[PDB]
Amino acid sequence: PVYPCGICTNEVNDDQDAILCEASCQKWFHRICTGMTETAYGLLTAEASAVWGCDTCMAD
Amino acid sequence: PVYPCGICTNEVNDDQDAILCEASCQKWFHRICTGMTETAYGLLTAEASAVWGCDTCMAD
Ligand SMILES: [Zn+2]
Ligand SMILES: [Zn+2]
Ligand SMILES: [Zn+2]
Ligand SMILES: [Zn+2]
């Protein structure tokens, strides 16, 4: 079970909407599990100079 | 008290779209100077999970 999603623990494939948490942990998340819209997601992933952090890393 | 835009050296004021580099240095940049679009700008300021880094910090 290779890149486990941080929220749901199931594997993240390339043909799923996935984001890396560059804020710290370096875990991937299914976009769906994080609750983030396709509209936020596609834009984040189109701006290279933008980077994201998960709910847990932004909490500390 | 002056905030020079890390690209153009001119002050960043309140009536101007601006963005802080939290990857690293922590200078303010006018949105216009970065060549960042308004939609990316709205996402980045809206979403607290999304942080921005300038070309110099992202570069190295
Ligand atoms: Zn998931
Ligand atoms: Zn994280
Ligand atoms: Zn400027
Ligand atoms: Zn910077």
Side-chain angles (χ1 to χ4, degrees):
Chain A
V2 175
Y3 305 91
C5 167
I7 299 208
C8 83
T9 94
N10 307 298
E11 81 186 44
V12 179
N13 338 297
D14 336 73
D15 60 329
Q16 295 164 323
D17 283 14
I19 23 202
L20 183 56
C21 172
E22 319 214 49
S24 175
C25 66
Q26 305 291 307
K27 306 210 194 44
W28 288 90
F29 298 74
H30 295 109
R31 170 212 124 231
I32 266 125
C33 309
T34 80
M36 176 199 281
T37 47
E38 263 170 288
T39 53
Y41 167 82
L43 227 356
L44 257 227
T45 101
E47 194 63 331
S49 65
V51 301
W52 173 90
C54 80
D55 245 350
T56 282
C57 287
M58 235 57 201
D60 213 78
Chain B
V2 78
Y3 295 99
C5 167
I7 284 180
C8 83
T9 289
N10 308 299
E11 76 181 31
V12 175
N13 316 302
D14 273 21
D15 40 16
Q16 272 157 350
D17 300 339
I19 174 115
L20 217 215
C21 180
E22 309 166 75
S24 204
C25 64
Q26 299 173 300
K27 308 182 224 172
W28 276 100
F29 302 70
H30 287 115
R31 205 209 101 224
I32 297 170
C33 308
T34 62
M36 187 190 285
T37 50
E38 310 200 37
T39 320
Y41 180 77
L43 197 229
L44 276 159
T45 59
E47 265 48 329
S49 272
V51 304
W52 182 83
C54 81
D55 281 320
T56 299
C57 301
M58 296 286 96
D60 228 309

